[PDB]
Amino acid sequence: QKTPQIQVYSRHPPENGKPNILNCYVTQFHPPHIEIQMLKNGKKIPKVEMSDMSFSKDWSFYILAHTEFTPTETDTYACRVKHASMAEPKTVYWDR
Amino acid sequence: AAVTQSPRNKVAVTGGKVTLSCNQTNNHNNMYWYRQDTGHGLRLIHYSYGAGSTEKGDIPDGYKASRPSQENFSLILELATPSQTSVYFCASGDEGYTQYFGPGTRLLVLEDLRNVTPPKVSLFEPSKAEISHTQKATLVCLATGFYPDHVELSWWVNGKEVHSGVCTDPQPLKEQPALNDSRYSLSSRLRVSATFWQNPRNHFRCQVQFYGLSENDEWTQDRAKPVTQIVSAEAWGRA
Amino acid sequence: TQVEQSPQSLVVRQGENCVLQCNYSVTPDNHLRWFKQDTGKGLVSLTVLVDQKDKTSNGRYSATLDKDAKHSTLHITATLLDDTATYICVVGDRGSALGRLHFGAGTQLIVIPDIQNPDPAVYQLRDSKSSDKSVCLFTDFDSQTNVSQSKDSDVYITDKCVLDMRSMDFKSNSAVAWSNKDFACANAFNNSIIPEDTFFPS
Amino acid sequence: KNYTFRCLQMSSFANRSWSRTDSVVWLGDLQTHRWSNDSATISFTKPWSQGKLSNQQWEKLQHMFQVYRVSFTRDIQELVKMMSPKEDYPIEIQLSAGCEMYPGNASESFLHVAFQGKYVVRFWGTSWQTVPGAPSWLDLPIKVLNADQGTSATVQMLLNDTCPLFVRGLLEAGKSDLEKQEKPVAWLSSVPRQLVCHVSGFYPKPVWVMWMRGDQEQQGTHRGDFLPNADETWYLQATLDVEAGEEAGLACRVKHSSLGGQDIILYW
Ligand SMILES: CCCCCCCCCCCCCC[C@H](O)[C@@H](O)[C@H](CO[C@H]1O[C@H](CO)[C@H](O)[C@H](O)[C@H]1O)NC(=O)CC/C=C\CCCC[C@@H]1C[C@H]1CCCCCCCCCC
Ligand SMILES: *[C@@H]1O[C@H](CO[C@@H]2O[C@@H](C)[C@@H](O)[C@@H](O)[C@@H]2O)[C@@H](O[C@@H]2O[C@H](CO)[C@@H](O)[C@H](O)[C@H]2NC(C)=O)[C@H](O)[C@H]1NC(C)=O
Ligand SMILES: *[C@@H]1O[C@H](CO)[C@@H](O)[C@H](O)[C@H]1NC(C)=O
Ligand SMILES: *[C@@H]1O[C@H](CO)[C@@H](O)[C@H](O)[C@H]1NC(C)=O
């Protein structure tokens, strides 16, 4: 097995009220069965897009999820990942 | 690259255990069991990739398979069934694509064994008329009174099987064809040169191999237990 | 049925040529094999074709394979009596032991034997152990005589049957009759349509 | 300079009867194809993904893959039977295959296989073989795969002739995308006291990002990894651990081929 490395980052320079795209990049995991969600205030964002799964030279998997988002003062965005390599799911919160 | 099968022919009853064995010396990792039924090809039942393995094939139901060794792949029928009446074929091969087939084994599973009955063999001696008109001598063998139709009729001259100049009925005929499961009758011919027949030192023998009961089947009637056996008849040449 | 053969059966006078057809949908098709199976026996390989368009030969047998068309043929030149048999098409889906073979149901060939010199007769043969009993052998008729079964249930008449004395390059049809009934070899084959020049001894 | 064409396959066999096989395809860092398990058919992810192949060629090539896929699945399953109980599901095979192109009409081709995440097998020359470190038991699988002369000639044809040919055609049809220039955008931020330079939107991947006090490249910089964005551009960031208060007069110089000469300078 290998543990997922999650990375949450925005496509454009973040700015409140101004729309954008938020990326969650999951990498370096084996076996490739994974569940990835993207959360607004701990709640499943409905329209989330996945790239096709792929793998590096070190044969480890990666996959990019993203969704549209408007960042605000009072809204938290996170990426929750379930994998057989983890007892409980790892949530990584966005940070400006 | 050879492959053997035993038995080569078995009459059996519903519910009986039946075991078909295949043996090969070629050190072939892989072995296969098929069954051939009129109007289908061979269909695979079980196969093996080596000692200890057995895999389900295309029609595995009713059959269990056993690879105790590289040499033996055996097919086992715990509860036989009329539907398992077939002609069974074993094969082996190594890692490439050719499968080397065995001679095949015939199985007949009957409901009851109450009718099983071995044959009466008669041998009939060449006509003087034929001899004098053709310069040839035809022996005729008749096997009769038998049930079921699992006989192998063979011709032997001086203890050596002969095929040349032989013709056996391609199927036996039924003695009472309007009766539930009547006894059968089969005839064969062996034609030789009149001199051959005239030689008093040639021994001629018609031999019928009847496939019936095994010594370990219950026999419930008073007549001789109709076992798998050989019935034959013989004559010497004459001048 | 991913391996269809044709015709289901066919009859031919010895000497004649014939072709057998095999069509398949199997995928993939690494190789096609033609087996031959005598009535009662097992499976003799005749040829195996492996290329996209392929031709092969084994004595009097030739064969083709077109993989684009998924079609093979089997030509038997100048048939002999021993060709009477079932011919079976088999398609292997790998060039390794990982493959499964897919079997046609064969084509049943029957070759009629050429009787160059007929001499039809009905003789009476005598049981070795018991001179009381006997049989009637109707013999040396040509292929265009069929043999009709008994009128009485008490009488038994078997069917035509060709033997090949390879020693002397000589063939002959025969059929046998017997009964316990007022039964004799003049009478035995009456209800059968036998040649008018048949030898009937004393 | 030297593009690499990569056909990455990943297949999963859960138990005796559930498997699935998904491939995607790359030319450098751009996806050209994608073939889902539940698709009978391979998908162009670029208008020029067919290359300079006529339809006839493509349809025959694709059909070779359609057959292979189905054939691949059964064989693994049969190979697991041959080995068992030494090996058992779940199993993960992954293939990586393609060719790397060079000046001249020069290219090396590869076909590497991995089992439960470890690289173990390759096609090389004329046959399969294990690589150093592989388990000895593979010798039976490999002896079997090498029995199949028909697969060997085909694979030999795909590696020696078809890949370099095809990929040479791709690079003609893709010139526009392959030689695309996208301008990076940058922003600054901080946390516990770590300065952070965000750069995003740039294509192609080479880029130079450095923190600076004036003309003196602050050497403590840390380049992060290249993360992708969904639109086929790149994202990257550089951090600098600094004593709180020392932020004054720090800049972030970013160089990129997109930016004809004029760099991006951001002051704190
Ligand atoms: C436990 C096990 C661990 C070890 C496990 C070891 C695993 C080793 C497995 C490797 C062999 C598996 C297939 C062979 C298979 O096994 C045969 O079955 C099959 C079929 O074989 C049968 O049928 C053939 C006729 O088509 C021949 O007649 C052949 O002789 C016959 O056998 N043979 C093939 O189909 C030949 C093709 C084989 C390899 C092609 C390279 C595949 C790699 C690519 C990356 C995969 C998918 C990407 C697709 C998308 C790209 C499209 C973009 C354009 C690109 C130009
Ligand atoms: C195809 O080329 C190989 C050699 O190329 C290597 O293997 C390929 C699969 C690919 O990965 C390349 O980039 C590799 O460099 C030929 O194999 C040689 O064959 C000769 C005679 O056939 C043999 O004696 C040599 O040992 C082989 N050489 C090697 C390095 O293994 C092969 O003949 C070519 N096949 C076809 C159909 O073109
Ligand atoms: C095989 O795996 C799948 C999921 O991984 C599961 O749903 C299914 O029950 C399994 N199938 C069998 C036949 O055991
Ligand atoms: C993947 O595709 C194959 C071939 O179409 C199919 O039979 C198989 O069940 C599919 N598996 C899944 C998990 O969808």
Side-chain angles (χ1 to χ4, degrees), chain A residues 1 3-17 19-27 29-34 36-43 45-46 48-72 74-79 81 83-87 89-95, chain B residues 1-127 129-170 172-175 177-179 181-214 217-221 223-239, chain C residues 1-3 5-7 9-40 42-107 109-115 117-128 132-142 144-149 154-159 161-166 168-178 180 183-190 192-195 197-202, chain D residues 2-5 7-15 17-55 57-59 61-85 87-104 106-107 109-117 119-174 176-179 181-182 184-192 196-212 214 217 220-222 224-240 242 244-252 254-261 263 266-268:
Chain A
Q1 276 165 343
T3 320
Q5 303 295 296
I6 307 156
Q7 264 149 305
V8 194
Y9 52 101
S10 64
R11 170 70 176 77
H12 304 279
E15 168 157 5
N16 301 31
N20 201 348
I21 291 153
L22 180 63
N23 298 327
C24 174
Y25 186 47
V26 210
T27 47
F29 59 100
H30 219 293
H33 182 94
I34 208 162
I36 288 171
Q37 306 179 326
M38 291 194 66
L39 303 181
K40 192 184 202 281
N41 315 313
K43 208 179 309 193
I45 296 164
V48 178
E49 299 211 47
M50 298 284 163
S51 63
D52 306 293
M53 203 166 291
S54 202
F55 53 77
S56 315
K57 300 207 188 169
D58 78 347
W59 301 94
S60 55
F61 290 98
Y62 62 85
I63 182 166
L64 174 59
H66 72 282
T67 198
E68 292 181 322
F69 86 130
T70 285
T72 83
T74 59
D75 279 306
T76 68
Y77 298 91
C79 188
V81 173
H83 203 244
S85 80
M86 295 175 313
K90 202 206 303 177
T91 312
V92 164
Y93 287 86
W94 184 49
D95 165 278
Chain B
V3 166
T4 52
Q5 289 184 229
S6 84
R8 289 275 267 90
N9 204 300
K10 177 112 204 163
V11 187
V13 74
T14 294
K17 146 169 273 176
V18 175
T19 284
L20 307 180
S21 318
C22 182
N23 179 264
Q24 58 99 5
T25 69
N26 304 327
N27 194 10
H28 282 174
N29 272 27
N30 320 292
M31 298 187 70
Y32 313 78
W33 271 110
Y34 306 79
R35 66 174 281 169
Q36 178 182 67
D37 300 311
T38 55
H40 311 72
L42 271 59
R43 291 159 302 182
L44 188 62
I45 302 172
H46 289 300
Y47 61 108
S48 191
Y49 279 133
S53 147
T54 36
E55 297 304 324
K56 279 182 163 92
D58 283 318
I59 53 150
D61 285 338
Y63 307 97
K64 193 168 187 201
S66 155
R67 194 88 187 280
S69 77
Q70 191 75 344
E71 214 194 48
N72 296 304
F73 191 31
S74 159
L75 187 79
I76 305 153
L77 295 58
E78 312 281 30
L79 299 157
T81 319
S83 63
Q84 298 184 299
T85 297
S86 188
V87 164
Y88 291 86
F89 276 105
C90 169
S92 67
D94 68 15
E95 79 273 22
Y97 60 77
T98 316
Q99 304 198 334
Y100 299 87
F101 285 89
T105 298
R106 300 197 196 151
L107 181 76
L108 174 70
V109 172
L110 297 161
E111 305 272 37
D112 205 336
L113 301 178
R114 73 203 150 83
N115 286 324
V116 176
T117 308
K120 274 273 202 306
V121 176
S122 284
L123 171 61
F124 299 83
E125 283 176 40
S127 162
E130 174 195 12
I131 282 182
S132 79
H133 182 99
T134 67
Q135 285 302 275
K136 303 206 232 313
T138 300
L139 303 74
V140 166
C141 189
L142 282 190
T144 68
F146 66 98
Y147 185 76
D149 78 342
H150 282 228
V151 296
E152 273 150 27
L153 192 148
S154 51
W155 280 100
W156 295 73
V157 182
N158 303 307
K160 279 225 178 50
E161 175 158 30
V162 311
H163 309 275
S164 204
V166 169
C167 190
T168 308
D169 297 342
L173 48 80
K174 313 176 82 172
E175 305 191 326
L179 267 180
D181 35 4
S182 85
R183 291 131 147 65
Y184 295 94
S185 278
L186 176 85
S187 83
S188 197
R189 277 124 279 180
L190 165 58
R191 193 172 217 185
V192 302
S193 86
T195 304
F196 205 73
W197 169 248
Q198 274 149 6
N199 193 329
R201 290 176 52 215
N202 298 336
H203 202 192
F204 294 91
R205 192 181 272 284
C206 175
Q207 156 179 302
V208 169
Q209 170 63 261
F210 167 74
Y211 290 97
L213 269 47
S214 200
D217 287 5
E218 296 163 28
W219 192 239
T220 162
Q221 302 163 49
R223 51 160 172 108
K225 182 189 226 307
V227 294
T228 296
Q229 80 202 246
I230 291 195
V231 191
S232 85
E234 44 81 45
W236 294 86
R238 296 152 98 266
Chain C
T1 177
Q2 304 196 108
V3 184
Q5 290 191 241
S6 192
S9 53
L10 75 92
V11 186
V12 300
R13 302 207 294 295
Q14 173 196 316
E16 291 178 352
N17 293 3
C18 77
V19 172
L20 306 176
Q21 320 263 10
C22 175
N23 290 269
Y24 64 95
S25 57
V26 165
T27 306
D29 37 352
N30 183 80
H31 71 268
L32 192 149
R33 198 200 294 287
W34 278 96
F35 277 116
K36 179 181 189 283
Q37 181 178 47
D38 294 340
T39 294
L43 306 153
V44 170
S45 193
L46 300 169
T47 191
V48 47
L49 296 115
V50 309
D51 301 342
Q52 281 276 139
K53 316 314 171 82
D54 203 333
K55 289 151 201 304
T56 54
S57 43
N58 182 344
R60 285 168 23 246
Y61 310 118
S62 42
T64 70
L65 164 54
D66 183 326
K67 279 190 206 181
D68 302 348
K70 306 209 164 200
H71 168 250
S72 177
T73 70
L74 178 59
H75 188 304
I76 303 181
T77 316
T79 53
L80 301 171
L81 170 56
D82 300 334
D83 293 323
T84 307
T86 275
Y87 292 84
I88 282 178
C89 189
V90 187
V91 169
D93 56 29
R94 300 292 197 290
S96 87
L98 294 176
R100 316 287 265 240
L101 302 174
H102 307 255
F103 292 78
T107 294
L109 172 67
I110 277 161
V111 183
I112 300 311
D114 197 349
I115 301 300
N117 294 276
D119 186 0
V122 162
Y123 316 100
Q124 178 156 289
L125 297 60
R126 187 55 47 113
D127 175 29
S128 57
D132 333 284
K133 319 183 205 186
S134 153
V135 304
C136 304
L137 169 63
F138 173 44
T139 182
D140 304 2
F141 48 90
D142 64 346
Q144 321 145 328
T145 287
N146 320 287
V147 180
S148 298
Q149 307 302 299
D154 280 349
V155 185
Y156 307 98
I157 287 148
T158 92
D159 221 353
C161 197
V162 60
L163 57 86
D164 187 340
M165 299 167 77
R166 303 189 168 283
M168 308 174 191
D169 197 41
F170 166 98
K171 300 133 172 62
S172 85
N173 292 298
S174 20
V176 180
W178 65 96
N180 305 351
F183 174 84
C185 308
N187 296 336
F189 300 88
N190 281 352
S192 177
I193 179 166
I194 79 189
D197 72 345
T198 294
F199 190 85
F200 280 107
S202 297
Chain D
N2 299 1
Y3 294 92
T4 293
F5 177 75
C7 308
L8 314 189
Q9 165 172 300
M10 59 217 102
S11 320
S12 315
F13 299 71
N15 44 57
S17 57
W18 187 99
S19 99
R20 82 166 296 149
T21 295
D22 297 287
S23 323
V24 314
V25 181
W26 301 90
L27 185 51
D29 61 8
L30 303 175
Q31 182 173 7
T32 53
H33 304 76
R34 156 203 297 166
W35 186 18
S36 195
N37 188 84
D38 38 41
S39 178
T41 199
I42 296 160
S43 293
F44 304 148
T45 68
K46 285 298 210 292
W48 40 267
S49 289
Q50 174 157 313
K52 296 282 186 228
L53 295 185
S54 79
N55 296 340
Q57 291 156 316
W58 179 247
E59 229 64 51
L61 183 68
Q62 174 172 245
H63 179 251
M64 184 276 295
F65 282 112
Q66 285 172 344
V67 171
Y68 149 87
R69 183 159 88 159
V70 177
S71 300
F72 171 79
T73 302
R74 199 186 80 183
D75 284 0
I76 295 302
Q77 294 171 311
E78 294 298 313
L79 281 174
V80 170
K81 309 213 200 158
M82 198 174 277
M83 303 293 78
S84 78
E87 289 298 327
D88 197 358
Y89 307 113
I91 275 158
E92 270 290 330
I93 320 291
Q94 288 144 264
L95 275 70
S96 163
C99 44
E100 181 169 345
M101 314 302 294
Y102 307 101
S107 71
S109 315
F110 47 90
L111 196 182
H112 293 203
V113 181
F115 180 83
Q116 314 285 49
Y119 170 32
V120 282
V121 169
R122 73 181 179 170
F123 197 87
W124 175 255
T126 170
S127 47
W128 305 98
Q129 62 167 50
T130 53
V131 305
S136 296
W137 61 260
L138 288 174
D139 288 330
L140 184 53
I142 274 201
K143 190 170 157 182
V144 174
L145 297 155
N146 277 324
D148 181 0
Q149 300 152 74
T151 302
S152 183
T154 311
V155 171
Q156 282 187 58
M157 197 200 215
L158 301 163
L159 306 188
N160 294 8
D161 307 334
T162 308
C163 187
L165 172 64
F166 177 74
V167 174
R168 195 146 295 298
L170 272 185
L171 299 149
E172 263 176 74
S176 260
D177 291 358
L178 287 187
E179 274 157 31
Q181 291 291 340
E182 304 291 329
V185 154
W187 56 109
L188 319 171
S189 98
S190 60
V191 68
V196 168
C197 198
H198 304 263
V199 199
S200 193
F202 64 92
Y203 196 76
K205 191 150 146 164
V207 75
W208 186 89
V209 192
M210 201 53 52
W211 282 99
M212 302 203 303
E217 288 167 33
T221 297
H222 185 244
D225 311 348
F226 291 88
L227 320 178
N229 293 313
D231 63 352
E232 308 204 285
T233 54
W234 289 102
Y235 178 103
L236 152 76
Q237 83 193 18
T239 66
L240 190 57
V242 294
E246 299 183 319
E247 288 98 336
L250 286 170
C252 186
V254 152
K255 281 163 194 307
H256 197 257
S257 46
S258 149
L259 317 179
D263 299 324
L266 284 204
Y267 293 89
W268 181 247

